[PDB]
């Protein structure tokens, strides 16, 4: 019900993050503005 999800980047697709969300409250993929060390600057992140 809370699966582990992972936040790939949106410029370069590195799978930089991993966390949990509630699958029935949020049936769509999370978008957050997290850091990316490949790029060295904040970018967007969707799920996989």
């Amino acid at each position: 019900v809370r699966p582990k999800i992972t936040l790939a980047c949106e410029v370069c697709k590195h799978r930089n993050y991993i966390t949990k969300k509630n699958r029935r409250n949020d049936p769509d993929r999370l978008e957050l503005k997290k850091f990316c060390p490949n790029c060295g600057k904040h970018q967007a992140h969707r799920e996989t």
């Binding site: 019900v1 029935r24 409250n25 049936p27």
Partner: protein, 552 residues
């Protein structure tokens, strides 16, 4: 010599499996039909095969030298023009190139000298490679087969269930190879579907048609692909092969549970018994039991909530009355000289081909669209409940418990106090399905919260606006036997020749012809006895040749 295949693909939404260990293949020219109950994953299969949805755990894979087309169950027809919406795909591979011919139209010598040959020269060949040189001479030949609206009609709101005549004219003009389509016989007539049973019957290419009616699938498909709880099964037959094969699978699996629960009684009282003197309770029969009580939980489960319509207040001697009505639009006058009184304790069926004005007749009765001439006498002995074709009461951003219950906890339905969560559970949405949004739902679950929020006032005159669509043969009977035991006067618009043959007493037909496209005919009698009247009130058994979508 294959056109689509899957490896060991498994796909799930929630803890509700849609596929698990599904390996199957598809030949070119395989008239595949897809069946199954509502919510069983007919389109979640078909989204992946179109390439939009990725599987979870497996490999979905199209063949290389081929192409795909898709008709979703609500085609997202963008709103520019109808003659737009036949070349912006279909000939959409050519419009991206025929904007360059307009640039090089009058052929000046300015700014290009060696592109006088090579850049313009590919346009000389791609106007003869695909043999799409004119693009607007056989485009009229295409739209004179779907019987489309005229070319200068901007689809801002004016198309009802004739959106789908345009979207069929898109991807059948693409001429694809993998031809995927969710429910073509939705919203169509008994002359456009009867056309589509020949264009898909002399068609090079591979077809997977997801459908629910018994009679489209008998003439189109040649194999069946069902979808049970996760598991697929290919067949060889018709739709009646599926209903006998589904009945025996649920029976002989039901007989397993009527054996496994029996030997679960003795393996429980044996565990409940105390141990004797020196002996030991054998620890390989507690592992035998505590494992066996896990195949007594996940195996047996089912649910099917019957549709029931609430009962409203007492209906008087008048229901609604319409005398010499005139209504159309600017030049397009679709109702002339119609007079009828709507009966008491019956079922009224509205029969007419598409684009004639069946939905607008209920706009006048509910009162969202005032007529031109005539009079609509209503009476104060009637309270209105109106389910609609557009399903606009459903908001695609909020979930099932707010789409119908408006966020609060006890709703008024029959002027009574029935709780919200217990009311939506009467339509199948229970437990985990109270938290899911409204675009996520199926086409059946879309057409069942439609009845949840519009049969909420619970009046005594209900207007069914295409209820026979997007739902299987098990909930269709739950609506066929919920308005035969209704106190009075449900009115239904339907194209389904075997839904009005069983529940109808009052035909509201349309015998319009060339000199006036506005004649309507009132009748008292069931649909099956109306037809022998029409063979002798109109011409002698005259109430066709195919229209080729392209000559090449």
């Amino acid at each position: 010599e294959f056109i689509y295949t899957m490896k060991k693909v498994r796909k799930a939404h929630g803890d509700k499996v849609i596929l698990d260990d599904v390996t199957l293949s598809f030949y070119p020219g395989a008239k595949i039909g897809v069946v199954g109950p509502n919510g069983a994953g007919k389109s979640s299969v078909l989204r992946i095969m179109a390439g939009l949805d990725k599987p979870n755990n497996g490999d979905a894979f199209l063949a290389t030298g081929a192409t795909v087309g898709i008709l979703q169950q609500e085609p997202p027809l963008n709103e520019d023009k109808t003659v737009r919406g036949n070349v912006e795909e279909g000939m959409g591979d050519i419009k991206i190139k025929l904007d360059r011919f307009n640039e090089v139209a009058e052929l000046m010598a300015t700014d290009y000298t060696d592109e006088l040959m090579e850049e313009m020269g590919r346009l000389q060949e791609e106007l003869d490679h695909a043999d799409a040189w004119d693009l607007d001479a056989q485009l009229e030949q295409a739209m004179d087969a779907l019987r489309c609206p005229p070319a200068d009609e901007p689809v801002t709101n004016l198309s009802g269930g004739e959106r789908r005549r345009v979207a069929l004219c898109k991807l059948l003009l693409s001429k694809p190879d993998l031809l995927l389509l969710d429910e073509p016989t939705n919203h169509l007539d008994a002359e456009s579907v009867q056309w589509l049973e020949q264009h898909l019957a002399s068609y090079p290419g591979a077809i997977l048609a997801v459908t629910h009616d018994r009679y489209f699938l008998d003439n189109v498909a040649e194999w069946i692909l069902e979808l049970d709880r996760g598991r697929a099964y290919p067949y060889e037959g018709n739709y009646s092969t599926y209903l006998e094969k589904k009945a025996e699978r649920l029976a002989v699996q039901g007989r397993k549970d009527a054996k496994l629960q029996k030997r679960l009684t003795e393996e429980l009282a044996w565990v409940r018994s105390g141990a004797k003197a020196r002996q030991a309770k054998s620890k390989a029969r507690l592992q035998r039991y505590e494992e066996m009580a896990a195949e007594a939980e996940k195996t047996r489960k089912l649910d099917f909530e019957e549709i029931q319509i609430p009962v409203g207040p007492r209906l008087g001697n008048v229901v609604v009355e319409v005398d010499h009505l005139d209504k159309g639009y600017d030049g397009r006058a679709l109702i002339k000289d119609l007079s009828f009184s709507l009966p008491r304790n019956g079922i009224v069926g509205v029969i007419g081909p598409n684009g004639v004005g069946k939905t607008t007749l209920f706009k006048t009765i509910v009162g969202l669209e005032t007529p031109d001439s005539g009079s609509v006498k209503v009476g104060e002995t009637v309270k209105l409940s109106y389910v609609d074709q557009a399903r606009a009461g459903i908001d695609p951003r909020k979930t099932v418990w707010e789409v119908v219950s408006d966020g609060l906890d006890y709703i008024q339905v029959g002027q009574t106090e029935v709780p919200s969560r217990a009311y939506v559970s009467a339509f199948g949405f229970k437990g985990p399905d109270q938290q899911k949004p409204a675009g996520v739902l199926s086409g059946g679950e879309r057409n069942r919260l439609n009845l949840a929020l519009t049969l909420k006032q619970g009046g005594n005159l209900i207007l069914l606006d295409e209820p026979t669509n997007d739902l299987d043969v098990e909930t269709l009977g739950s609506l066929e036997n919920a308005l035969l035991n209704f106190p009075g006067c449900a009115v239904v618009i339907s194209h389904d020749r075997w839904f009005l043959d069983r529940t109808c007493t009052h035909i509201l037909a349309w015998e319009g012809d060339d000199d006036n496209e506005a004649k309507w005919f009132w009748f008292e009698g069931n649909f099956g006895a109306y037809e022998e009247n029409k063979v002798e009130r109109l011409g002698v058994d005259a109430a066709v040749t195919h229209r080729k979508l392209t000559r090449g």
